[PDB]
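Methods — Computational structure assignment.
A single polypeptide chain was analysed. Its primary sequence is given first, followed by the predicted tertiary structure written as structure tokens.
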Amino acid sequence: KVGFFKRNRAALEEDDEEGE
């Protein structure tokens, strides 16, 4: 559960898809 939260910080939440 709540894995996405970690999969994000995996690269420093580099997935700033929404942070764009």
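Note: Residues 3-9 form the longest helix (7 residues).
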